[PDB]
Design a protein around this ligand. Sequence first.
Ligand SMILES: [K+]
Ligand SMILES: [K+]
Ligand SMILES: [Mn+2]
Ligand SMILES: [Mn+2]
Ligand SMILES: [Mn+2]
Ligand SMILES: [Mn+2]
Length: 135
Amino acid sequence: EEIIWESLSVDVGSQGNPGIVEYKGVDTKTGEVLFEREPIPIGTNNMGEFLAIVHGLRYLKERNSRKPIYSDSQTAIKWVKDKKAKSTLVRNEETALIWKLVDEAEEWLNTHTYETPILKWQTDKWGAIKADYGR
RNA sequence: ACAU
DNA sequence: CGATGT
Ligand SMILES: [K+]
Ligand SMILES: [K+]
Ligand SMILES: [Mn+2]
Ligand SMILES: [Mn+2]
Ligand SMILES: [Mn+2]
Ligand SMILES: [Mn+2]
């Protein structure tokens, strides 16, 4: 119903899908950018949405913050819940970096605990997530 | 269909 | 119009 303003919002941006992928996390209340990942030459939207949530979990855990995370990706929220990113992206030499990062994110989820609620940003009611790339 |  | 996903 209502936005939980005391939260972290994350999103992917890309040039092509598959294509160059980046992501960032912002304070939902203020829009302040709290982290941004350097562009990865080839990935998918969903891989980037997944990495963004996992990075958010790690960022909040390191700072002892109980804030929830908002994501607009139904897929990535499920992959994080499952601790398994079921991407269709070919594993080859050009996708090795994104796949390394995804594998390492899964590995982190399988070796750490968190209570962080991972919440669906309701774009249909609230507009674009505050971490959106405006593109 | 829904979500990107 | 193309794509990634449940
Ligand atoms: K969206
Ligand atoms: K589809
Ligand atoms: Mn998104
Ligand atoms: Mn894996
Ligand atoms: Mn977006
Ligand atoms: Mn967009």
